[PDB]
Amino acid sequence: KVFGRCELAAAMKRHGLDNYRGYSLGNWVCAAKFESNFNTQATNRNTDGSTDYGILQINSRWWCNDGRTPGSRNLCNIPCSALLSSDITASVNCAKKIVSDGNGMNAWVAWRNRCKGTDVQAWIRGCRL
Ligand SMILES: [Cl-]
Ligand SMILES: [Cl-]
Ligand SMILES: [Cl-]
Ligand SMILES: [Cl-]
Ligand SMILES: [Cl-]
Ligand SMILES: [Cl-]
Ligand SMILES: [Cl-]
Ligand SMILES: [Cl-]
Ligand code: NA
């Protein structure tokens, strides 16, 4: 499922992500934009052999099980395929664990490089929320 911008903002808010660990909703929408272009089915292999999954490109090295990432963990206790659903519940719950891990949203390299310090409120501007 390819979300619209305001549609995804609303779904993220309904699942408790707005201001989670102090990160406003626009930060989360911005990260989703540049990780997946709002596509829940996005996957992207990494050089180390892990794979990133879903709207927030959650990585199999630490966070989900895909059966082909040697030496990895599954700290969200989910199959990585759950992160591709049209229902974003699994991605949101796992992102809450990731953003709590110590470095905040810097865990998402694209958030640091393309969202951090910018006018992230633009990503929710105009939305009925
Ligand atoms: Cl957009
Ligand atoms: Cl917010
Ligand atoms: Cl915002
Ligand atoms: Cl594995
Ligand atoms: Cl584990
Ligand atoms: Cl599994
Ligand atoms: Cl949803
Ligand atoms: Cl933080
Ligand atoms: Na894994």
Side-chain angles (χ1 to χ4, degrees), residues 24-27 120-124:
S24 65
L25 188 57
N27 280 285
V120 295
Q121 195 274 342
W123 292 100
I124 62 164

Side-chain angles (χ1 to χ4, degrees), residues 59-69 71-75 78 80:
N59 191 252
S60 66
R61 176 73 54 195
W62 289 104
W63 305 109
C64 61
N65 179 54
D66 66 8
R68 65 172 196 191
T69 309
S72 71
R73 303 285 289 279
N74 178 11
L75 294 176
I78 50 165
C80 297

Side-chain angles (χ1 to χ4, degrees), residues 6 12 14 32 46 49 55 77 81 89 92-93 122 125:
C6 292
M12 285 175 160
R14 193 178 80 84
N46 302 131
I55 54 158
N77 301 120
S81 64
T89 300
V92 171
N93 289 346
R125 190 167 307 154

Side-chain angles (χ1 to χ4, degrees), residues 9 14 36 41 44 47 59-60 65 72 76 80 103 109-110 112:
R14 193 178 80 84
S36 67
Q41 297 197 80
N44 284 292
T47 45
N59 191 252
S60 66
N65 179 54
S72 71
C76 291
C80 297
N103 295 324
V109 174
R112 177 169 59 78

Side-chain angles (χ1 to χ4, degrees), residues 10-67:
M12 285 175 160
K13 179 178 186 181
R14 193 178 80 84
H15 287 87
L17 213 47
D18 53 313
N19 220 29
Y20 190 86
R21 287 281 166 152
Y23 288 94
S24 65
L25 188 57
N27 280 285
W28 295 104
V29 174
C30 184
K33 172 73 177 177
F34 293 125
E35 291 297 355
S36 67
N37 205 14
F38 302 149
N39 189 348
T40 69
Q41 297 197 80
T43 62
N44 284 292
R45 200 82 184 252
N46 302 131
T47 45
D48 71 350
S50 64
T51 301
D52 289 350
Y53 295 86
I55 54 158
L56 287 166
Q57 287 293 276
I58 290 169
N59 191 252
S60 66
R61 176 73 54 195
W62 289 104
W63 305 109
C64 61
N65 179 54
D66 66 8

